[PDB]
Design a protein around this nucleic acid. Structure first.
Ligand SMILES: O=c1ccn([C@@H]2O[C@H](COP(=O)(O)OP(=O)(O)OP(=O)(O)O)[C@@H](O)[C@H]2O)c(=O)[nH]1
Ligand SMILES: [Mg+2]
Ligand SMILES: [Mg+2]
Ligand SMILES: [Zn+2]
Ligand SMILES: [Zn+2]
Lengths: 49, 43, 85, 263, 65, 133, 114, 196, 164, 783, 98
RNA sequence: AUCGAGAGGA
């Protein structure tokens, strides 16, 4: 009934817990607040997979 | 065991909410209360 | 000096809750160390409970120093305070 | 004869169904109860494990054994070990049992309470026969054994009463009803819709007169005539339960009446 | 985990019965309830001794040692 | 002492307002016109059907304990069917000589109104209510 | 590990004896009997039978904490009747009902078949 | 724990004999509270139990699954052909007397979960045990024979009360307490107490 | 709006009134307008009721807000308390927030004020100014292990005669 | 912070808590293995020597016993080992560290501890089973249940520490908390629901029980009270036997809605001493309400007495309900068929009335609304309609009960649950609230993929149509799920936020305490307010009181206070006074009756300006109303016998008392004014109540009498002062900082109105206390 | 009326532990979360080999039991063979007080 | 025995 999906590090069962992140290479637009100079800003996290 | 295997961690505008697009991907009710709530997710 | 005279004391003749909680407590600390008792013991043998009977019959020898804010103070005896409360 | 009355309906080796007439509620219930708790019996208490290479861990095995039933027929002639004068236990107060299964087959090698052995001297009395009601002969599946599995333990069974543990209870479940129309209005019947249709009647409606709506509520009425059914686990044949029941209930009213003369 | 003796809530020795329940529908192709009704269990507290009961002793015995 | 009130009343309203063992009753006297009475009856013990004359009395006796009756040789003013014990409270005056006393018998209330309750119903934490036929 | 040994439900401890009668501080001709190691099985019985006795003014019982078998019952009777006697006569009757319901059961049993 | 977030701790063990009972002789394992219910608005808890009894009676599998054609209605109908007031309840008798129960009481089988926690593995006391080296205050960890913090919160509550010698006691005579030497001029701890 | 107010006949009578409500603030401007009541105009900003009408008003508009949070939630707290909060916030001349900006920079103790926020840098410039310490506040005597002058410790006991 | 303001401590314990409906209020069940390891440094006295020498032999294992024996010579005698453990020669002047014992003072604590209440002195009853047990009505102010909650307890080590424990922190005293000028402990759960049952008019119980019940109350005087019914079968009324717990001279009068001294509804409440007269007992009385039993018993009789009372109610009700049962079953939400169609056809009429609105704005005929978006009004417009629906269709399930409906009975007692809990399930769920607006177009222009874009009807944007009983449709589930998350999210945030505001509020008044001149000072010794809370009165000795002088007509006023002896119509008929016909006419004393009235009209003009609004009820010290009922009993008064006073008695006497009501003592002049000023309000009441045409017309005092009431009002006033020493800073903060934590919605339900978003919840309190420059919802509200 | 796809079956938005709650569509939605808080803390039979492994801490239930009422989905999570609870007969009634 | 992170209880 063990399904696995973990590692063994010195008699100990270690699981890798999936990590979230914002996706890259998607171009998004963002309104920027009232007390600052810039009205709109567009961002892209360019990185090679 | 069978949960702690299918888990989902988020670092750190409305991140803790159960955003619409969650449909069928993240469970809408399986989450840890207080502390880091809604930030940790299950499949 | 400093000390404000008996005549012209302007505080509460009524004993404060705190005052008595300390009066009973300090006499209890003595009584516990079997130092002389000042009343007929009606079968009672609990330090704290004795102090109540002594404060009942006003036979406790301790004067209270009350400090007003400027630095001066007022003196009342547990012999002259009202223990109504 | 005289006071409180009985009228049996069914009387199996395991079930006594009866009515009970002209008694107080206070006394019926207090007989229903003394039945559950307070009736001497015999069961395993001191399990002394020598070898156990089982899938089952030691004190499990040795908790089933307690629950397992043992013939408590002549139990009234065997001292409580708390009462005895012997060191830990003798043939006058305790009966000693030995299990002993090795595994053997390639197949699973089951262990039943049929497999137990009596070792203690019985002096000659009806005590310590693991109760077997199962058709094929082997009541109560203790534990399984694969191949080289061994199990060998020694048992001591002491007299006791279900007020201590429920291993000593000879009772099982006790059915008990009184007044099936509610002419005592002891309750008040819930309904979203209707009392008469929403709740079914008891199998006991048969025996008692219905109400007749045209009559005022019977006020000076009293708790009377109770519908008991008694089961038996098997250490005592149903009747003796409900005899010793009445008997103990009496016997410890005695110790009071007595205690009054002493002090 | 090896069928109970007595049921918890009443204490009808539901001990010797497990093996039988395994026969009355394996062999005597019955449906559940009717197999309980025949075994002796009117009262569902005992009746739920054996309808829920899961028998793992079956697996632990499979480990070789 | 002795008695304090005596009359015959005509029941004009039985009211099962959200109860099952108690009913509020409504009645006026056959004998005299200007009077009215309200009373919480234990309908389950003495059933009351509308337009159903009753006789209503008040005493102050027939103080230590209430002992179980044991009427092997006892005596109360028990000639009647239905009897309660209670306490009088407000002594209200509806303008001019009209007057009304309020009684509580363990929560069951009684509002009696008339005029010739005169030299009779002093606040005596006594008062037994009695009903027959 | 804070668990009161089982056999402390029916065995009498040490010092502790089965009956303890004390004058009722409050009511004339009254008494409070303390029953060590005994409870509902036997408390209710003696109360609801004792109420049948017509020369009995007052009678009631209560287990005070469910943690202990020890139950109390207090009994008031009529001028010239001893509380203790009233118990004796009550207990006795209960003997008699149960020594009866025994033999009345005895014969109904024998006469049944299967 | 139920399966819905009714929690609870056993406030008392009761024997069968003292416990309420249904005319058939059954007796609960398990006696929560009415009030458990309107507050938390778990209804499933109520369903799951209904249709669960039905599942002990029938020999059928219960089906709890989410979006289906199960209703209270569809179920009840399936109980009052097995013979129990078709919305659960059951008529019971108080155990102490034997009297009937003046109100009938939803009763029926269900899951319960045995969570960790409890009790002889958090129960703890201390009257001076071991202390730290860095502060001469008592050590943290139940196990390690610790001592429970009197957090700044607590202090606050102590002051409200005005009970001040006890606030000092909590803070000197247990925990720390120490005697140093000062020079009445310079005002520090240079003093070398060549004692005795 | 509802408003209860005396009819000539002595009793209070329910009387309606038209009330204008706004999004934004500039008080010293609206109140000078014709046709309005410059005696009962009100803006939820207690920081401008202060600027325009003066510290004493400030006190009670602040109160009104502290209040129209508890009672509006349906909870009740006795004046004295919110008064004392409102008061402490007010005595020091203007408004004095309950943060390490307002009250805590105030000239209290040193120990007693480091038991809050920015703990070290307070102790530092407490040794640059060589600022003295009263040791009369609470926390001071908490840190030193003394019986602090509170309820119990508010007064001194002794030691009289008497004995004759 | 970690090590000086908050130290790890000795002589303590912590376990799990349980209910014990058989323990008494001020007690705590401390399991053996604990009070087997805690010790109290007790000295050797000729008093306790005997009960000590036997603790040594016994030692650390048997319970009542000891651990260490402490001598003079520093040395510790360790008697869990030791050669000399089984003997000892004890002199006076040593110490015997005995085990903790039955009936000792201890401090019971439960964190978050944010409350002069989270901290209480209790008595110790040593018990088996390893839990702390505590009695059921000390549950509100510790704020616990027993769901695995656990708790803290330290044991004093010094003879006064333990005095200062029981004489200040003792639960009994702490019954009436200075937060809310009302008690903070009441009857709840079973006991509450039950008392409502036991107290219905329908509810009678007969001999058998009415004997045990009486025996169940420990301070019962052994008198079976005479039954309500004595006709066939002598029934005792519920009410009747409960009135056995209620002590003597306890007077209470209420009135709920339509209540008429005859209680058709059986509502309201009246206790005429000891016994109750009518009404139904629940939360509004036997609960920690403003002016119910608990509040009244405590001031009237005392703490120790009220703290006994608490137990006595429960012993009974609990016992009664023990043997009467009650329960709740799914069917308790099965609402009636012919109404079911009714409910669903009421949403159906709300559903099609959003249509015509949607069809309107889509046809461009909707305007404006004023000061909003075209869109933004429609959004408001729909939440109203859809809450209107939910709440109407809710109260169609609230009427469809069903008195033998278990649920309603609870809400009808006030033991648990509310109307919304009944609308939810049985009827329908409602609109799903997120970020103040209804469910947001997560996916572009539609909330889920199973909808079409641009869909603005109820369930496209998160209306759950069904109840809980029918079950939530997939689409809905996720929606409910969403709003659900937000609920949890901003708990683990509102808690976090509050518990900063508390702390800031705390470290900021920390030390403001009342001094020995009744002024209020800090560390520096600055005055903050010159008489604590503008009157010098400890909040705990306070009750709301009607004023009356404010309301009613001037006509109504001149027929209440005008004693015109000169006017042959407005005199006190010889009916009222022993004087009367000798006082009519006269001028010598009319000039006193005159200047009484004039002072009373100036009251009426004064109050009308202080309380602009009319509202005539205000918290004030000494309940006068209740001192009259006391006089109307303690002196057995016949409303037919005509006083014995002079006018001079009344009018002169009341002025003298007026000057005797001291608050500030100073012999100067400015002080003697603040004397007047902090006494001023109270007096307007006092003037209003002890006025001539009242003291003779309404409540009909004698001389004898009166003087009693006069001395009482004085004696009760003086006891209501703030006790200099009273640490008021901590008390302020704590008391505003706790509601904070038990607030809901940092949004609100003003959010039907998408513009009456006036910033509250915590956020407001955060903006106020931060003294924010940029506040969120600023507003002129011109008149 | 312009579909392209259809959902496999709507109980598949649930995660591994909610698919144990019987009747999630009849709970208020927070309490559905709490059962997934717990139930993880709720002991049963962590694996079958449990008597062959050496782990700090191990809890095994004397008598575990497939619930009397399952989720269709339970079956792929193998609950019915490795269950974490017992079938108690529960009495929703106010009693002695405790 | 200390510093670091997480898991969980209210
Ligand atoms: O004072 C209270 C306390 C508790 N409650 C009820 O319980 C909660 C309030 O307090 P909790 O938040 O502690 O209850 P909970 O159900 O959320 O968590 P548990 O303690 O059961 O683990 C609320 O959900 C409410 O239903 C109150 O209604 N009022
Ligand atoms: Mg709670
Ligand atoms: Mg809790
Ligand atoms: Zn022997
Ligand atoms: Zn069973």
């Amino acid at each position: 009934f063990d399904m696995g999906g973990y590692f063994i590090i010195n008699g100990s069962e270690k699981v890798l817990i999936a990590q979230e992140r914002s996706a890259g290479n998607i171009v998004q637009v963002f309104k920027k607040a009232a007390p600052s100079p810039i009205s709109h800003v567009a961002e892209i996290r360019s990185a090679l997979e | 065991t069978l949960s702690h295997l299918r888990r989902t961690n988020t670092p750190i505008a409305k991140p803790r909410q159960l955003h619409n697009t969650h449909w069928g991907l993240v469970c809408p009710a399986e989450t840890p209360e207080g502390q880091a709530c809604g930030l940790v997710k299950n499949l | 000096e400093k000390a404000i005279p008996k005549d012209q004391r302007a505080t509460t003749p009524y004993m404060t809750k705190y005052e008595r909680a300390r009066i009973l407590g300090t006499r209890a600390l003595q009584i516990s160390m079997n130092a002389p008792v000042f009343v007929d013991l009606e079968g009672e043998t609990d330090p704290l409970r004795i102090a109540m009977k002594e404060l009942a019959e006003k036979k406790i020898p301790l004067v209270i120093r009350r400090y007003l804010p400027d630095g001066s103070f007022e003196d009342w005896s547990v012999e002259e305070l009202i223990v109504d409360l | 004869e005289e006071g409180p009355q009985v009228k049996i309906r069914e009387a199996s080796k395991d079930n006594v169904d009866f009515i009970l007439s002209n008694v107080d509620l206070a006394m019926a219930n207090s007989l229903r109860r003394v039945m559950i708790a307070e009736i001497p019996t015999l069961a395993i208490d001191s399990v002394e494990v020598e070898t156990n290479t089982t899938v089952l861990a030691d004190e499990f095995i040795a908790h089933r054994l307690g629950l397992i039933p043992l013939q408590s027929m002549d139990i009234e002639q065997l001292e409580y070990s708390r009462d005895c004068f012997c060191e830990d236990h003798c043939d006058k107060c305790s009966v000693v049992l030995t299990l002993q299964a090795f595994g053997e087959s390639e197949s699973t090698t089951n262990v039943y309470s049929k497999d137990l052995v009596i070792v203690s001297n019985l002096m000659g009395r009806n005590i310590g026969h693991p109760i077997i009601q199962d058709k094929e002969g082997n009541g109560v599946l203790i534990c399984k054994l694969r191949k080289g599995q061994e199990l060998k333990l020694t048992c001591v069974a002491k007299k006791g009463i279900a007020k201590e543990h429920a291993k000593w209870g000879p009772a099982a479940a006790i059915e008990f009803e009184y007044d099936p129309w509610n002419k005592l209005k002891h309750t008040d019947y819930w309904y979203e819709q209707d009392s008469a249709k929403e709740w079914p009647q008891s199998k006991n409606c048969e025996y008692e007169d219905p109400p007749n709506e045209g009559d005022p509520f019977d006020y000076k009425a009293q708790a009377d005539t109770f519908y008991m059914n008694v089961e038996s686990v098997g250490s005592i044949p149903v009747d003796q339960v409900v005899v010793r029941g009445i008997d103990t209930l009496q016997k410890k009213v005695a110790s009071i009446l007595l205690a009054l003369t002493q002090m | 985990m090896i069928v109970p003796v007595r049921c918890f809530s009443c204490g009808k020795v539901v001990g010797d019965k497990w093996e039988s329940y395994l026969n009355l529908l394996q062999e005597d192709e019955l449906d559940e309830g009717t197999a309980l009704s025949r075994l002796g269990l009117k009262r569902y507290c005992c009746r739920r001794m054996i309808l829920t009961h899961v028998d793992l002793i079956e697996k632990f015995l499979r480990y070789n040692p | 002492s002795n008695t304090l009130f005596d009359d015959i009343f005509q029941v004009s309203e039985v009211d099962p307002g959200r109860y099952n063992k108690v009913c509020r009753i409504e009645a006026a006297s056959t004998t005299q016109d200007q009077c009215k009475l309200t009373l919480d009856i234990n309908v389950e013990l003495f059933p009351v059907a509308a337009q159903d004359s009753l006789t209503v009395t008040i005493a102050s006796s027939l103080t230590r304990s209430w002992r179980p009756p044991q009427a092997g040789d006892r005596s109360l003013a028990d000639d009647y069917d239905y009897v309660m014990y209670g306490t009088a409270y407000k002594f209200e005056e509806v303008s001019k000589d009209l007057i009304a006393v309020y009684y509580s018998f363990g929560g069951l209330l009684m509002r009696l109104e008339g005029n010739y309750r005169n030299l009779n119903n002093l606040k005596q934490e006594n008062a037994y209510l009695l009903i027959r036929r | 590990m804070n668990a009161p040994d089982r056999f402390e439900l029916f065995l009498l401890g040490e010092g502790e004896s089965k009956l303890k009668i004390d004058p009722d501080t409050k009511a004339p001709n009254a008494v409070v009997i303390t029953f060590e190691k005994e409870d509902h099985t036997l408390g209710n019985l003696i109360r609801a039978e004792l109420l049948n006795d017509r020369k009995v003014l007052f009678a009631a019982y209560k287990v005070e904490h469910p943690f202990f078998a020890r139950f109390k019952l207090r009994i008031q009777t009529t001028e010239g009747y001893d509380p203790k006697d009233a118990l004796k006569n009550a207990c006795n009757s209960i003997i008699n009902k149960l020594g009866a319901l025994k033999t009345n059961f005895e014969t109904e049993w024998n006469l049944q078949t299967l | 724990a139920s399966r819905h977030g009714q929690k609870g701790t056993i406030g008392i063990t009761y024997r069968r004999e003292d416990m309420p009972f249904t005319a058939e002789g059954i007796v609960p394992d398990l006696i929560i509270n009415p009030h458990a219910i309107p507050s938390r608005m778990t209804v499933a808890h109520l369903i799951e139990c209904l249709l669960s009894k039905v599942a002990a009676l029938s020999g059928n599998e219960g089906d709890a699954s989410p979006f289906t054609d199960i209703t209270v209605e569809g179920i009840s109908k399936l109980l009052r052909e097995h013979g129990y007031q078709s919305r659960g309840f059951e008529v019971m008798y108080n155990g102490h007397t034997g009297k009937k129960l003046m109100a009938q009481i939803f009763f029926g089988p269900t899951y319960y979960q045995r969570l960790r926690h409890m009790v002889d593995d958090k129960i703890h006391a201390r009257a001076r045990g071991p202390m730290q080296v860095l502060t001469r205050q008592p050590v943290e960890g139940r196990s390690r024979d610790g001592g429970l913090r009197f957090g700044e919160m607590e202090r606050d509550c102590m002051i409200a009360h005005g009970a001040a010698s006890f606030l000092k006691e909590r803070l000197m005579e247990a925990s720390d307490a120490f005697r140093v030497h000062i020079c009445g001029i310079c005002g520090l701890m240079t003093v070398i107490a060549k004692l005795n | 709006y509802d408003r209860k107010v005396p009819s000539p006949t002595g009793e209070y009578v329910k009387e309606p009134e038209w009330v204008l409500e706004t999004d934004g603030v500039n008080l010293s401007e609206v109140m000078t307008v014709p046709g309005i009541d410059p005696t009962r105009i009100y803006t939820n900003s207690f920081i401008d009721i202060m600027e325009v009408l003066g510290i004493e008003a400030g006190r009670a508009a602040l109160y009104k807000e502290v209040y129209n949070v508890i009672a509006s939630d349906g909870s009740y707290v006795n004046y004295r308390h919110m008064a004392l909060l409102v008061d402490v916030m007010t005595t020091q001349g203007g408004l004095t927030s309950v943060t390490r900006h307002g009250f805590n920079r105030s000239n209290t103790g040193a120990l007693m004020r480091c038991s809050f926020e920015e703990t070290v840098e307070i102790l530092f410039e407490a040794g640059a100014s060589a600022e003295l310490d009263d040791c009369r506040g609470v926390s001071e005597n908490v840190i030193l292990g003394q019986m602090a002058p509170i309820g119990t410790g508010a007064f001194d006991v002794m030691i009289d005669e008497e004995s004759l | 912070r970690g090590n000086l303001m908050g130290k790890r401590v000795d002589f303590s314990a912590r376990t799990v808590i349980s209910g014990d409906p058989n323990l008494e209020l001020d007690q705590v069940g401390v399991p053996k293995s604990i009070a087997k390891t805690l010790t109290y440094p007790e000295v050797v006295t000729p008093y306790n020597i005997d009960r000590l020498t036997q603790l040594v032999r016994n030692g650390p294992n048997e319970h009542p016993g000891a651990k260490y024996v402490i001598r003079d010579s520093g040395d510790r005698i360790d008697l869990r080992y030791s050669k000399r453990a089984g003997d000892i020669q004890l002199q006076y002047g040593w110490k015997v560290e005995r085990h903790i014992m039955d009936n000792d003072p201890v401090l019971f604590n439960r964190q978050p501890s944010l409350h002069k209440m989270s901290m209480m002195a209790h008595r110790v009853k040593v018990i088996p089973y390893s839990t702390f047990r505590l009695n059921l009505s000390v549950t509100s102010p510790y704020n616990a249940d027993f769901d695995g909650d656990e708790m803290n307890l330290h044991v004093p080590q010094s003879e006064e520490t333990r005095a200062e424990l029981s004489q200040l922190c003792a639960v009994p005293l702490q019954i009436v908390s200075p937060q809310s000028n009302k008690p903070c402990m009441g009857i709840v759960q079973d006991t509450l629901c039950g008392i409502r049952k036991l107290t219905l008019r329908d509810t009678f119980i007969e001999l058998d029980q009415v004997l045990n019940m009486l025996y169940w109350v420990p301070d019962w005087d052994g008198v079976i009270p005479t039954p309500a019914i004595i006709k066939p079968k002598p029934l005792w009324s519920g009410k009747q036997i409960l009135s056995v717990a209620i002590p003597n001279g306890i007077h209470l009068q209420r009135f709920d809605e339509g209540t008429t001294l005859l209680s058709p509804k059986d509502n309201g409440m009246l206790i005429i001493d000891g016994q109750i007269i009518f009404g139904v007992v629940e939360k509004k009385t036997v609960g920690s309400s403003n002016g119910g039993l608990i509040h009244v018993v405590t001031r009237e009789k005392g703490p120790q007495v009220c703290a006994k009372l608490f137990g006595n109610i429960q012993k009974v009700v609990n016992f009664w309900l023990l043997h009467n049962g009650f329960s709740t079953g799914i069917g308790d939400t099965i609402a009636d068929g012919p109404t079911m169609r009714e409910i669903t056809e009421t949403i159906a009429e709300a559903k099609k009335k959003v249509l015509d609105v949607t069809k309107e704005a889509q046809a461009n005929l909707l305007t404006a609304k004023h000061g909003m978006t075209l869109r933004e009004s429609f959004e408001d417009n729909v939440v109203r309609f859809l809450n209107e629906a939910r709440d109407k269709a809710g109260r169609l399930a609230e009427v469809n009960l069903k008195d033998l409906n278990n649920v309603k009975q609870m809400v009808m007692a006030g033991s648990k649950g509310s109307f919304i809990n009944i609308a939810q399930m049985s009827a329908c769920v409602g609109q799903q609230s997120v970020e103040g607006k209804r469910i947001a177009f997560g996916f572009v222009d539609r909330t889920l993929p199973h909808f079409s874009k641009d869909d603005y009807s109820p369930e496209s944007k998160g209306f759950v149509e069904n109840s809980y009983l029918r079950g939530l449709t997939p689409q809905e589930f996720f929606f409910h799920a969403m709003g659900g998350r937000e609920g949890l999210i901003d708990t683990a945030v509102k808690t976090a936020e509050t518990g900063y505001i508390q702390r800031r509020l705390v470290k900021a008044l920390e030390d403001i305490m009342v001094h020995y001149d009744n002024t209020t000072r800090n560390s520096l010794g600055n005055v903050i307010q010159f008489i604590y809370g503008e009157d010098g009165m400890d909040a705990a000795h306070i009750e709301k009181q009607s004023l009356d002088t404010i309301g009613g007509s001037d006509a109504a006023f001149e027929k209440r206070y005008r004693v015109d002896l000169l006017n042959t119509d407005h005199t006190l008929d010889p009916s009222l006074l022993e004087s009367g016909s000798e006082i009519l006419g006269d001028l010598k004393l009319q000039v006193l009756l005159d200047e009484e009235y004039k002072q009373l009209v100036k009251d009426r003009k004064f109050l009308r300006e202080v309380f602009v609004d009319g509202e005539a009820n205000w918290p004030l010290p000494v309940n006068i109303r209740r001192i009259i009922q006391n006089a109307q009993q303690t002196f057995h008064i016949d409303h037919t016998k005509p006083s014995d006073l002079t006018i001079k008695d009344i009018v002169l006497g009341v002025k003298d008392l007026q000057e005797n009501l001291l608050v500030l003592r100073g012999k100067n002049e400015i002080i003697q004014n603040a004397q007047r000023d902090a006494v001023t309000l109270f007096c307007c009441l006092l003037r209003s109540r002890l006025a001539t045409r009242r003291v003779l017309q309404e409540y009909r005092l004698t001389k004898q009498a009166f003087d009693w009431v006069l001395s009482n009002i004085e004696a009760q006033f003086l006891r209501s002062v703030v006790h200099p020493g009273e640490m008021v800073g901590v008390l302020a903060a704590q008391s505003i900082g706790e509601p904070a934590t038990q607030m809901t919605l940092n949004t609100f339900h003003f959010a039907g109105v998408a513009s009456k978003k006036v910033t509250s919840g915590v956020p407001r309190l955060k903006e106020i206390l931060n003294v924010a420059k940029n506040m969120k919802t600023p507003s002129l509200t011109v008149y | 009326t312009t579909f392209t796809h259809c959902e496999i079956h709507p109980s598949m938005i649930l995660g591994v532990a909610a698919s144990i709650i019987p009747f999630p569509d009849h709970n208020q939605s927070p309490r559905n979360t709490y059962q997934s808080a717990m139930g993880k803390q709720a002991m049963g039979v962590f694996l079958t080999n449990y008597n062959v492994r050496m782990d700090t801490m191990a809890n095994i239930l004397y008598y575990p039991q497939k619930p009397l009422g399952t989720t269709r989905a339970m079956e792929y999570l193998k609950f019915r063979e490795l269950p974490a609870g017992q079938n108690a007969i529960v009495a929703i009634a106010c009693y002695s007080g405790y």
